[PDB]
Amino acid sequence: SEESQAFQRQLTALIGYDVTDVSNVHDDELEFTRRGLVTPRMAEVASRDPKLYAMHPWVTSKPLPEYLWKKIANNCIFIVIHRSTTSQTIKVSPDDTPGAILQSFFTKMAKDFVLRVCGRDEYLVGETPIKNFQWVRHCLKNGEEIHVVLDTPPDPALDEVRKEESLWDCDRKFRVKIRGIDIPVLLTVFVEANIQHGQQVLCQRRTSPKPFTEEVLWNVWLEFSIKIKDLPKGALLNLQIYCVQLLYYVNLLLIDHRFLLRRGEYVLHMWQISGFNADKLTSATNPDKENSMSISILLDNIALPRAEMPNQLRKQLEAIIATDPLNPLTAEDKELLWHFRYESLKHPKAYPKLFSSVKWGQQEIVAKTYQLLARREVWDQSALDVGLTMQLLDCNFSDENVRAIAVQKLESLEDDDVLHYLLQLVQAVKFEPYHDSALARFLLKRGLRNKRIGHFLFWFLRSEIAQSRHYQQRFAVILEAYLRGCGTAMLHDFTQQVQVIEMLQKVTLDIKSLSSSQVISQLKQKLENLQNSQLPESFRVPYDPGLKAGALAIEKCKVMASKKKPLWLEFKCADPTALSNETIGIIFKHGDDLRQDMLILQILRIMESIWETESLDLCLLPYGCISTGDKIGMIEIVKDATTIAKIQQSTVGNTGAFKDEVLNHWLKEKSPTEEKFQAAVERFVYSCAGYCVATFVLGIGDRHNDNIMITETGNLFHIDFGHILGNYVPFVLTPDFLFVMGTSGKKTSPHFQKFQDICVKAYLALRHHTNLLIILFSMMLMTGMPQLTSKEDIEYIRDALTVGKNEEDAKKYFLDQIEVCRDKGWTVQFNWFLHLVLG
Ligand SMILES: COc1ncc(-c2cc3c(C)nc(N)nc3n(N3CCCC3)c2=O)cc1F
């Protein structure tokens, strides 16, 4: 076709990568994965209720928390239904199905149609009680009204999808022939060949070192110790170059996507080393065929197809099944898990440890391991454990089958929870030995089934494609698959968004180079230009798919006085049904890898829902933060907020003679009444408690004053998590914070004691999820925070969470942390100043 070759040029512009391209490949895997993905894409498209998918109701099925019940005066929810200019407040009960509120509106008045949210693109369709809509729970949580605009449902037509048009037999020890290396531009140098499987080295060999020149030959055959028949699927040939110090590396999947052993000549362009992480595992070769080191090799020139237990041993097994994810396994622990594998199968918590005790380098062991996977009755039975599920998905498990069972346990996640783990699940795609996987397809299905998950899946993939050459290819094939089944409706919004963001980026990069108030000239000037025959009517806010941004409030926009020059943008809600005029404040920025920030903000959301299991509310503000390309993205602006440093700075800048009372005054200054003031003190006790715990666990507690904000309503929140991570006292409980809790240097108080009891109850609450937090944190550092791995960096969280210790021993560990915070005063703060704001 041709109207199918225009559609191709378009997708490539949204992907930010040219998929169909074949200049940096050495096989049909990616092309093969595209073909393989046509069926999962089509099956989900052909199975999604057209209407329900057009309206994407945002429903949860979790019990309404205690705090939102104590927020319902009398089983009576006040929904304000607005038509044209009319308004009608109605009385609804926590089980009033949305559609059933029509027989409560057409019966409750007189003298087909769906409810939408005012200003938002957030419908209230489907067979669900109102107490199960995030929008509703968000109205009740922050003591707000419930505005609805009765209007015509969207038409599923706009969601139109464009019409789619033997190895176990040779005891031959494995061998690889090194032809040689050749860097186009420059010591001693040797090749290192490893046969790996799930971060587990099966065999190693090297080559006699030779002088480091523009071309280095060898013509050697490296005979490994692994029989051809013993090579597990997912096994990688990892080639490295030392001088001893590492310089280059590349990977080749010994068994391919067709289950055939690799044969023939290979010229691979090797990735460099800068100056552990997920990039080091890629099957992708360097696209930069010029600068980059190369390697020539050759492959051979074969397809792949109950008793009792003592008591001391039982207690030895249990001691191991209990140990946290990061606690290592002795060869003794492993032989133990393996010998009692059948007793280890009855315990789902044993799976990551038992499957890590398997010598994958042996055909017969894997054979029994699969016979073990056949007796999954217990695993399949057990309730879904995300902490356990994520574990079988990390860098430690390269076997297709083990991983698949974990993905199989994910199928039962409702849309609400997919959104909580989407970002990490997408980052987990980097651990997949193959381009096509149960996980890659799962994200595709979940992405196509619901518009919200799909909108977020897009940016997550888009972000990775634009700043990772190690994984862009695999991701590009996944995004393309998604874009060919999301519909023309969404295919259109992603176009508006890409257009809008790309114009703004250009403005950031240029205003960045031209550096005063003279700069304000261009900023205002360029912003008005783009506001014409460019910037389309309105785009969806990327970090909040519900919001639409209209015209650019030029007057409010500016450049910030930071090291780099991020823009401070403001837009009118492009939707008239809006209950206000409050603009949409977005911070635009180039110069930082915003992915680190996304990961942290996402862990913050996981913590809130962990605290929702225990009917708690630590009042955090995990504001929206979307990376949109190479070292660039946007950041939501919290309305009515200032830096804690700015509240101090009022009375001195060049000094910082930190007055232990300015904060409490500021709150009263901003509080309309004195009564609301107490609620702003209330919200402070909680938000300050939340970030104290969370920040401490994540080990980002040592914050530099500037990087802490407060709402004119009591909510406290840290910001700029990208800082403390991009360069590398417990948390932050300064005398001015404590002065809002009625205390000084050394004393107690009613409000303070409460603070200290919200913390311990939140700290221990997180410990009931040790394994989960450890996996996320460990999985976070590996895939998004290079130069923050080493191993010793991963093990920080083991101590923060106080592993081993009973609840009672931990409570007195956190309380002491709260103490190391008082015996410090402003030493810390004043010290940041002597530095950040100086040297
Ligand atoms: C990753 O990098 C970032 N992370 C965070 C910010 C940042 C968020 C921010 C928010 C969410 N709300 C409000 N009301 N001000 C903000 N703000 N202010 C502007 C100036 C100093 C405070 C911010 O700087 C900016 C970054 F660049």
GROMACS .gro file of C-alpha atoms in nm, residues 7 11 52-53 123 126 133 181 242 341 431 438 506 558 574 628 638-639 642 644 650 682 687 734 754 762 785 828:
model
   28
    7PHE     CA    1   0.114   0.570   0.863
   11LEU     CA    2   0.463   0.615   1.389
   52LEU     CA    3  -1.589   0.125   2.836
   53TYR     CA    4  -1.252   0.167   2.654
  123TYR     CA    5  -1.598   0.983   3.313
  126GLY     CA    6  -1.949   0.135   3.438
  133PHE     CA    7  -1.371   0.596   4.182
  181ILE     CA    8   3.934  -0.647   1.769
  242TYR     CA    9   4.048  -0.513   2.951
  341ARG     CA   10   1.310  -2.872   4.650
  431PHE     CA   11   1.616  -0.802   3.220
  438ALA     CA   12   0.540  -1.287   2.858
  506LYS     CA   13   1.358   2.395   2.153
  558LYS     CA   14   0.949   3.295   3.282
  574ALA     CA   15  -0.855   2.400   2.760
  628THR     CA   16   1.003   1.333   2.743
  638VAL     CA   17   0.211   2.241   4.325
  639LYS     CA   18  -0.023   2.541   4.363
  642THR     CA   19   0.718   2.788   4.866
  644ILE     CA   20   1.133   2.612   5.329
  650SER     CA   21   1.264   3.642   5.384
  682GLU     CA   22  -0.242   1.879   6.152
  687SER     CA   23   0.322   1.518   5.573
  734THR     CA   24   1.481   2.093   6.189
  754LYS     CA   25   0.162   1.242   6.807
  762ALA     CA   26   0.435   0.421   5.939
  785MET     CA   27   2.057   0.508   3.845
  828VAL     CA   28   2.344   2.013   5.885
   0.00000   0.00000   0.00000
